[PDB]
Amino acid sequence: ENFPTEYFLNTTVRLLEYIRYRDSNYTREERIENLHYAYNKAAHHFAQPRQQQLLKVDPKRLQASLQTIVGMVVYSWAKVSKECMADLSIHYTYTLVLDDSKDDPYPTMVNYFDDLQAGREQAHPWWALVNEHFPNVLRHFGPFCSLNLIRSTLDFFEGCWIEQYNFGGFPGSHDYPQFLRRMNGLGHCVGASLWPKEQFNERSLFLEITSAIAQMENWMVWVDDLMSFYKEFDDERDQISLVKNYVVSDEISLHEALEKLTQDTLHSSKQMVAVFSDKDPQVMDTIECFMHGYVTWHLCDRRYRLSEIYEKVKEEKTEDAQKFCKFYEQAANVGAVSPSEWAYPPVAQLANV
Amino acid sequence: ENFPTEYFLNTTVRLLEYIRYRDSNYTREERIENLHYAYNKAAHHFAQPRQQQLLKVDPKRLQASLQTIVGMVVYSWAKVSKECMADLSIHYTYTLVLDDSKDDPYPTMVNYFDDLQAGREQAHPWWALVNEHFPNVLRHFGPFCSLNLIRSTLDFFEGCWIEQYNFGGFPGSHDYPQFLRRMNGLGHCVGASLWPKEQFNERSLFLEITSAIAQMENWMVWVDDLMSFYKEFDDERDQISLVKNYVVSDEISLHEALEKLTQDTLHSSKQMVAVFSDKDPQVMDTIECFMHGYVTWHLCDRRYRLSEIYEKVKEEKTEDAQKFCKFYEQAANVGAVSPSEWAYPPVAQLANV
Ligand SMILES: [Mg+2]
Ligand SMILES: [Mg+2]
Ligand SMILES: [Mg+2]
């Protein structure tokens, strides 16, 4: 009934300690420069007439979606170039936006393969925009990493299709929940997009990169699920989250579902550190900066409402409460930025022009 | 080292006993009918000069691979049409060929996306043949199932790429083993290819089909990991396997890995029943025919050399050796068919003509 505040607090602090969440050389001024650069290129992109006409999305939602994504990319893909941040920001905004569509994909997918093989534009307008823009993203990567982004985005499309059914799985279908989360998680897209060929040699680091994808896929989706647990707790609109599907498919209490998620998240966090600590320094740096930035993004983006938790235990003398607050303040310290400092002008204004 | 023959018998018996292995998908006459029909069409396809030119494989290997796959398809896709069996046999023969192949995809995947988007033939000859043939397979399915086949085949390609490095994962990279197995397992391709639109309405059974894909993906791969353990054990190309990757990645004994696998496999089997038992009978039927036929195929087909094991423990007085031999005999009774009764003429002969 009530939110598991202490249990949530303990797990979150454990998660941050396990990943060695600490300060970086990534400054606020640098952040702002990156945020504005990525926002500005993406904003001009989505403001073009073709994009404005084929991408069915409410203007205010697009604006909010773009801002949250730019934040996610600039903060988590800390080592990539500005161009790479901008181009990845566009791709991930396309993916987030597809979740606003309730339109049945069936009719637009009947000739998917034949049109693809023939080089004809796809019937589904989202595929038309995404496949047209894709090269701007792939140009930053080698063939192996590119193949991964392509596959993950294709999986994501199928995941959105499945979700239109608002199905959490048949009771007893234990393998359904993760099958769905992987399908919609963009794990291999995220995992592989951390290695621009400009900074990494895909062939020389094949093993570390392949391993990063395998481990980051689960780390990223589970951390998102865990940190989204507070905002989703009482959301009666959101009915098929991973945790909620665990309840339905595994026939267990929400608490047990949360326990499952916590165990997987903490273990994933430890093996991440254990495996990459001794590997190539540049690789460990990218992985570590992703984890930290990804957490900071969740802590600083209003969408997750975690400030509400910080505000509820801000004066408790509990160990976890105090540790959570210190971490939170650390995050806001470098992540709490006013949108007026980078996200301007609005996409709709550039669209009218 | 030495093959855990003793434990191999223990696990195999447990699985067969739990699923209650019993193949009754065909009369001997029907089985021969389908095998020949599928083989004959596939044989004429692979004998075409274009196919002979681009598919780089030793004639004897192609021949042996085709017969192994015709058996897999006919034996497990018992409810689909002869045409579907044939077209699926061609597709899965392309994949098995790549499955044992040793090539570097890298150079021919550099312009993969751009060529795909422009409708230009792919540089990698395998993709050139597979994508050209694909429509003959997809015409049997609705858009959702088709999308699944496409994704799984693309995943499979990446899977074989990774295997080229003979990497079993970094010690402690717990997520690597299954990451790779799903990547190379063709799970969604197999699971989705069980629902031809001629017999099933993709929209009326969307949930059961999605569920079947999710659950069968793991049953399918795990069952093969267990049963194909023998032929892979000492094969250089198969040293990177789920079982052997569990050892390296999770730092555990081959024994523990096998027990882990069989436990998963038994659980997967249990939920398959629990979930589909009381669902649409036509769906349950296709699922049952696949599970039993899939096992029959592993016990009879050459590729898995399970006869060799039979010819060694047949005399042994162990209880497992007796259970295994009873099952092996039961499977041969229905599945042991002479190639001379259906696999003719040889591909090579049709090619020279
Ligand atoms: Mg394989
Ligand atoms: Mg193989
Ligand atoms: Mg195998």
XYZ file of C-alpha atoms in Angstrom, chain A residues 19-308:
290
model
C 29.128 1.555 -8.898
C 31.516 3.881 -7.049
C 29.313 6.892 -7.799
C 31.636 9.877 -7.341
C 32.627 13.265 -8.777
C 34.088 13.551 -12.268
C 36.104 16.063 -14.271
C 32.931 16.685 -16.298
C 32.031 20.271 -15.311
C 28.760 22.187 -15.263
C 29.926 24.599 -17.957
C 30.926 21.649 -20.145
C 27.541 20.054 -19.445
C 25.699 23.194 -20.494
C 27.743 23.470 -23.677
C 26.975 19.867 -24.574
C 23.292 20.099 -23.595
C 22.714 23.176 -25.771
C 24.660 21.766 -28.701
C 22.734 18.487 -28.750
C 19.416 20.258 -28.133
C 20.046 22.812 -30.872
C 20.824 20.278 -33.599
C 17.936 17.994 -32.582
C 15.501 20.906 -32.283
C 16.297 22.114 -35.792
C 15.942 18.538 -37.027
C 12.471 17.929 -35.588
C 11.362 21.397 -36.714
C 11.790 20.610 -40.441
C 8.472 20.359 -42.339
C 8.872 16.662 -43.311
C 9.572 15.674 -39.695
C 6.792 17.922 -38.447
C 4.344 16.280 -40.813
C 5.233 12.576 -40.565
C 5.971 12.377 -36.822
C 2.583 12.329 -35.092
C 3.318 13.718 -31.647
C 1.801 16.480 -29.550
C 4.170 19.501 -29.683
C 4.446 19.861 -25.905
C 5.157 16.156 -25.484
C 7.838 16.259 -28.195
C 9.484 19.239 -26.477
C 9.503 17.461 -23.116
C 10.634 14.183 -24.671
C 13.538 15.812 -26.530
C 14.736 17.605 -23.382
C 14.762 14.457 -21.242
C 16.635 12.529 -23.946
C 19.260 15.210 -24.541
C 19.870 15.178 -20.802
C 20.186 11.411 -20.805
C 22.699 11.375 -23.662
C 24.854 14.358 -22.682
C 25.139 13.040 -19.124
C 25.670 9.351 -19.884
C 27.671 9.328 -23.137
C 30.120 11.770 -21.496
C 33.122 10.834 -23.672
C 31.651 11.021 -27.178
C 31.836 14.106 -29.379
C 29.202 16.834 -29.539
C 28.062 15.607 -32.951
C 27.675 12.078 -31.606
C 25.666 13.356 -28.635
C 23.431 15.338 -30.999
C 22.858 12.444 -33.411
C 22.212 9.932 -30.620
C 19.826 12.451 -29.047
C 17.791 12.463 -32.242
C 17.652 8.637 -32.473
C 16.628 8.094 -28.842
C 13.999 10.844 -29.100
C 12.533 8.957 -32.088
C 12.352 5.814 -29.960
C 10.800 7.524 -26.936
C 8.224 9.202 -29.170
C 7.015 5.937 -30.811
C 5.550 5.147 -27.364
C 2.960 7.893 -27.963
C 1.448 5.963 -30.861
C -1.584 3.760 -30.355
C -1.819 2.955 -34.070
C -1.823 -0.740 -34.992
C 1.403 -1.534 -36.924
C -0.116 -4.492 -38.779
C -1.316 -2.625 -41.936
C 1.976 -0.728 -42.297
C 4.093 -3.846 -41.824
C 2.441 -6.182 -44.360
C 5.040 -5.304 -47.015
C 7.916 -4.438 -44.648
C 10.482 -6.887 -46.041
C 9.631 -6.463 -49.722
C 9.875 -2.686 -49.441
C 13.115 -2.994 -47.459
C 14.681 -5.396 -49.971
C 13.599 -3.208 -52.893
C 14.753 0.037 -51.321
C 11.258 1.566 -51.335
C 10.273 3.938 -48.529
C 8.581 2.159 -45.598
C 4.807 2.490 -45.180
C 4.976 3.160 -41.460
C 5.938 6.876 -41.219
C 8.129 6.286 -38.156
C 10.320 3.816 -40.051
C 10.472 6.312 -42.917
C 11.935 9.055 -40.708
C 14.138 6.772 -38.600
C 15.711 4.856 -41.506
C 16.284 8.079 -43.396
C 18.129 9.579 -40.401
C 19.946 6.428 -39.271
C 23.150 6.996 -41.333
C 23.813 10.190 -39.310
C 24.025 7.933 -36.288
C 25.804 4.945 -37.811
C 28.553 7.074 -39.367
C 29.962 7.350 -35.842
C 30.409 3.588 -35.648
C 32.134 0.564 -37.088
C 30.135 -2.229 -38.769
C 29.771 -4.436 -35.683
C 28.492 -1.658 -33.454
C 26.236 -0.434 -36.277
C 24.677 -3.907 -36.687
C 23.860 -3.821 -32.960
C 22.086 -0.439 -33.143
C 20.076 -1.594 -36.157
C 18.947 -4.807 -34.437
C 18.091 -3.117 -31.137
C 15.981 -0.504 -32.905
C 14.153 -3.219 -34.867
C 13.520 -5.082 -31.571
C 12.220 -1.860 -30.046
C 9.668 -1.477 -32.844
C 8.379 -4.995 -32.092
C 8.334 -4.215 -28.393
C 6.135 -1.159 -28.934
C 3.801 -3.297 -31.093
C 3.446 -5.897 -28.311
C 2.820 -3.218 -25.704
C -0.161 -1.842 -27.601
C -1.865 -4.976 -26.233
C -1.286 -3.903 -22.627
C -0.337 -7.516 -21.845
C 1.689 -8.441 -18.759
C 1.946 -12.135 -19.568
C -0.097 -15.243 -18.823
C 0.155 -16.450 -15.210
C 2.906 -19.079 -15.278
C 4.691 -17.499 -18.246
C 7.871 -16.839 -16.242
C 9.926 -16.039 -19.344
C 7.587 -13.310 -20.591
C 8.648 -10.295 -18.451
C 12.343 -10.174 -19.412
C 11.577 -11.177 -22.995
C 9.467 -8.006 -23.185
C 11.875 -5.712 -21.290
C 14.776 -6.755 -23.510
C 12.582 -6.245 -26.554
C 11.726 -2.664 -25.536
C 14.931 -1.770 -23.662
C 17.280 -0.703 -26.471
C 20.079 -2.486 -24.581
C 22.265 -3.393 -27.556
C 21.663 0.022 -29.081
C 22.795 1.723 -25.860
C 25.574 -0.780 -25.214
C 27.089 -0.515 -28.672
C 26.590 3.239 -29.105
C 29.149 3.823 -26.327
C 32.012 3.040 -28.730
C 32.494 5.572 -31.551
C 35.136 4.312 -33.993
C 36.718 7.748 -33.572
C 37.804 6.804 -30.044
C 37.725 3.008 -30.151
C 38.928 0.274 -32.492
C 36.020 -2.136 -32.730
C 38.227 -5.009 -33.877
C 40.940 -4.537 -31.231
C 38.392 -4.199 -28.449
C 35.856 -6.678 -29.858
C 35.826 -8.752 -26.671
C 35.405 -5.858 -24.241
C 32.793 -4.191 -26.436
C 30.785 -7.407 -26.927
C 30.987 -7.969 -23.158
C 29.922 -4.381 -22.469
C 26.805 -4.849 -24.590
C 25.936 -8.096 -22.801
C 26.375 -6.617 -19.349
C 25.144 -3.088 -20.009
C 21.890 -4.301 -21.596
C 20.714 -5.697 -18.267
C 22.322 -3.070 -16.054
C 20.753 -0.184 -17.948
C 17.187 -1.567 -18.132
C 17.153 -2.765 -14.518
C 18.536 0.486 -13.146
C 15.923 2.368 -15.176
C 13.239 0.039 -13.791
C 14.484 0.443 -10.221
C 14.809 4.213 -10.364
C 11.408 4.473 -12.109
C 9.734 2.399 -9.381
C 8.819 5.450 -7.296
C 7.076 7.394 -10.076
C 5.314 4.245 -11.305
C 4.195 3.012 -7.880
C 0.774 4.688 -7.924
C 0.510 5.295 -11.664
C -2.716 3.485 -12.563
C -2.117 4.404 -16.214
C 1.165 2.434 -16.374
C 0.059 -1.190 -16.163
C 2.799 -3.323 -17.733
C 6.202 -2.438 -16.250
C 8.789 -5.185 -15.701
C 7.999 -5.354 -11.994
C 4.250 -5.396 -12.612
C 4.717 -8.141 -15.207
C 6.749 -10.173 -12.684
C 3.702 -10.028 -10.406
C 1.314 -11.197 -13.125
C 3.554 -13.674 -14.935
C 5.312 -15.138 -11.891
C 2.312 -14.863 -9.570
C 4.196 -13.218 -6.714
C 3.655 -10.145 -4.539
C 4.834 -6.733 -5.706
C 7.366 -6.779 -2.870
C 8.844 -10.036 -4.134
C 8.898 -8.571 -7.642
C 10.782 -5.553 -6.306
C 13.122 -7.921 -4.454
C 13.839 -9.770 -7.694
C 14.625 -6.485 -9.445
C 16.814 -5.320 -6.560
C 18.834 -8.540 -6.484
C 19.409 -8.455 -10.241
C 20.347 -4.770 -10.178
C 22.838 -5.052 -7.324
C 24.468 -8.182 -8.744
C 24.681 -6.607 -12.194
C 26.302 -3.549 -10.617
C 28.960 -5.628 -8.873
C 29.872 -7.755 -11.888
C 30.154 -4.592 -13.990
C 32.845 -3.253 -11.678
C 34.490 -6.642 -11.158
C 34.846 -7.384 -14.872
C 35.955 -4.008 -16.246
C 38.045 -2.625 -13.380
C 41.219 -4.278 -14.697
C 40.513 -3.822 -18.418
C 41.518 -1.014 -20.788
C 41.320 2.323 -18.904
C 39.468 4.175 -21.683
C 36.860 1.386 -21.789
C 36.438 1.355 -18.012
C 36.085 5.144 -18.089
C 33.264 5.050 -20.644
C 31.446 2.350 -18.720
C 31.874 4.128 -15.416
C 30.805 7.494 -16.783
C 27.707 5.910 -18.323
C 26.626 4.343 -15.041
C 27.183 7.539 -13.065
C 25.655 9.848 -15.672
C 22.704 7.519 -16.136
C 22.055 7.642 -12.383
C 22.528 11.419 -12.187
C 20.058 11.828 -15.054
C 17.426 9.834 -13.155
C 18.134 11.798 -9.973
C 17.905 15.168 -11.703
C 15.100 14.695 -14.220
C 11.761 15.788 -12.717
C 10.089 12.911 -14.571
C 11.347 10.498 -11.910
C 10.170 12.695 -9.032
C 13.001 11.447 -6.824
C 13.233 14.954 -5.366
C 10.058 13.976 -3.500
